[PDB]
DNA sequence: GTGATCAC
DNA sequence: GTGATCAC
């Protein structure tokens, strides 16, 4: 699904930013919690990167 | 090792 | 076809 709320992330360029992820999803093996991942675009570079989402971010 | 995703 | 994202 696509994100709605902004997320506090560290961009690849090394800066803190508040970005809305274009896609969010859960990545987890059987039996374990795994992690929530967002796909973000660095507005400074236009480069795409992934980053952990807060555990309560809605998928 | 195992899980999903997609820009490259 | 995979880098890179994390937690357990």
Curated annotation (Swiss-Prot):
Q: Which UniProt keywords apply?
A: Chromosome, Cytoplasm, DNA-binding, Methylation
Single GO molecular function: double-stranded DNA binding
Q: Which residues carry this modification: N6-methyllysine?
A: 15
- The source's superkingdom equals Archaea
Q: Name one GO cellular component term.
A: chromosome
The record's subcellular locations are: Chromosome; Cytoplasm
Concerning PTM, the database record says: Methylated at multiple sites, to varying extents.
Family annotation (InterPro entries):
Cren7_sf (IPR038647), dsDNA-bd_Cren7 (IPR020906)
What Pfam families does the entry give? Cren7
Q: Which residues form a coiled coil?
A: none
Similarity comment: family membership: Belongs to the Cren7 family.
Q: What does this protein do?
A: A highly abundant chromatin protein, it binds double-stranded DNA without sequence specificity; there is approximately 1 Cren7 molecule for 10-12 bp of DNA. Constrains negative DNA supercoils. Induces DNA compaction and mediates intermolecular DNA bridging. Binding does not require protein methylation. Binds single-stranded DNA weakly. Increases DNA stability against thermal denaturation. Promotes formation of loose nucleoprotein structures with long DNA in the presence of albA proteins.
Quaternary state and interactors:
Monomer.
Protein name, as recorded: Chromatin protein Cren7
From what organism does this protein derive? Saccharolobus solfataricus (strain ATCC 35092 / DSM 1617 / JCM 11322 / P2) (Sulfolobus solfataricus)
Query: Which gene produces this protein?
Result: creN7
């Amino acid at each position: 699904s696509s994100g709605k709320k902004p997320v506090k992330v560290k961009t690849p360029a090394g800066k803190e930013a508040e970005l809305v992820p274009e896609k969010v999803w859960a990545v987890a093996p059987k039996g374990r919690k795994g992690v929530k991942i967002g796909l973000f675009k660095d507005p400074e570079t236009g480069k795409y990167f992934r980053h952990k989402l807060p555990d309560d971010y809605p998928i």
